[PDB]
Design a protein around this ligand. Structure first.
Ligand SMILES: Nc1ncnc2c1ncn2[C@@H]1O[C@H](COP(=O)(O)OP(=O)(O)OP(=O)(O)O)[C@@H](O)[C@H]1O
Ligand SMILES: Nc1ncnc2c1ncn2[C@@H]1O[C@H](COP(=O)(O)OP(=O)(O)OP(=O)(O)O)[C@@H](O)[C@H]1O
Ligand SMILES: Nc1ncnc2c1ncn2[C@@H]1O[C@H](COP(=O)(O)OP(=O)(O)OP(=O)(O)O)[C@@H](O)[C@H]1O
Ligand SMILES: [Cl-]
Ligand SMILES: [Cl-]
Ligand SMILES: [Cl-]
Ligand SMILES: [Cl-]
Ligand SMILES: [Mg+2]
Ligand SMILES: [Mg+2]
Ligand SMILES: [Mg+2]
Lengths: 117, 117, 117
């Protein structure tokens, strides 16, 4: 059993609901960073606070959740269901392998470093 | 696949040139974060906005681009050519495996999640 | 052999002592970011500046160091020794594979891109 990092870039105003939904499902641990970004070119022009970010990078938030591999699909599904709005700019999710996890306080590793105690 | 995350740490004043050159080559999707860092020991001491940084962490920008593996060399070439100044502190690039990519709005995955409209 | 990213999330007040202990041991290259986070549910409720945090995320610092795989254990040891306090919230470390490293100034790839010249 391996571990994975789910790295989701989502709208800043979706952070609270996504983190509630993840938490309600038992995926509590997460790290969040303020970022700016753009997605693919073309199609409907992205709007943020009232029509149009044609050239500049748009505020987003990055959520990183390290989970057991078997939980990745669950986590992605919860993020997409709760983050989406139907407009361009809703977000993108990347899954990255994590070879080791260590809890700083105790030097526990692996599965136990991810478990409620 | 496969997909890769190109994570480049560059000078803050090189964001605009690098973003434009990447865009002009088709690499539009990107996530940008403000960071501070140090590189290897040695090199002329870095100044930044008038202040010398003999020991302290220096402002940088992190750019993250998830791309098809076959595009990584092109992305690297573009970043190096446009980010460089010839002085120590120009940056460093890390290539990290990505096992899955999902577009939030549509649940599209893989190559389709990187494709332009 | 291979290269790894050590991604450590620690308390903001521990940045100074942890970075100095790393650089004293030769692990000078690092990228630092401001983040917020939470760990696992249960047990003692995390406190920060005089209040409990449960729904709300707590300020942390992320330190990213790309090192040789054979340096990871020592890096993790230094971080844990210096970052720990024994209270909930001390931190978590993730080890992520890095397939390629490139120095922007020179285009050097691999082992040399982590070394003083
Ligand atoms: N290939 C990528 N690499 C890195 N970050 C990306 C990439 N694609 C998107 N992002 C990040 O995700 C954010 C949201 O992207 P966005 O929702 O516009 O994706 P999209 O692929 O254009 O899909 P949509 O058509 O739904 O907009 C961007 O602002 C950026 O921060
Ligand atoms: N091994 C590393 N791990 C994490 N981040 C690093 C590492 N090396 C460099 N960085 C980041 O890249 C930034 C730029 O590094 P820098 O350009 O000084 O690299 P260098 O290896 O010292 O090459 P140069 O000789 O051109 O200075 C740093 O300030 C830091 O943010
Ligand atoms: N599974 C995870 N995924 C992503 N980030 C995490 C995860 N768990 C913890 N973090 C990050 O590490 C920080 C510190 O977590 P914390 O020290 O509370 O871990 P813990 O597992 O609850 O251990 P402790 O019992 O020692 O508190 C969090 O605020 C968050 O930034
Ligand atoms: Cl000291
Ligand atoms: Cl290890
Ligand atoms: Cl990563
Ligand atoms: Cl280095
Ligand atoms: Mg888009
Ligand atoms: Mg340097
Ligand atoms: Mg905790």
């Amino acid at each position: 059993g391996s571990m994975k990092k789910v790295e989701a870039i989502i709208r800043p105003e979706k952070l609270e609901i996504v983190k509630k939904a993840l938490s309600d499902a038992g995926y509590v641990g997460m790290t969040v960073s303020e970022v700016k970004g753009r997605g693919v070119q073309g199609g409907i022009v992205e709007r943020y606070r009232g029509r149009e970010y044609i050239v500049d990078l748009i505020p987003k938030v990055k959520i990183e959740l390290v989970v057991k591999e078997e939980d990745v699909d669950n986590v992605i599904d919860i993020i997409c269901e709760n983050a989406r709005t139907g407009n361009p700019g809703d977000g993108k999710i990347f899954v990255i392998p994590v070879e080791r996890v260590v809890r700083v306080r105790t030097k526990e590793e692996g599965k136990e470093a991810l478990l409620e105690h």
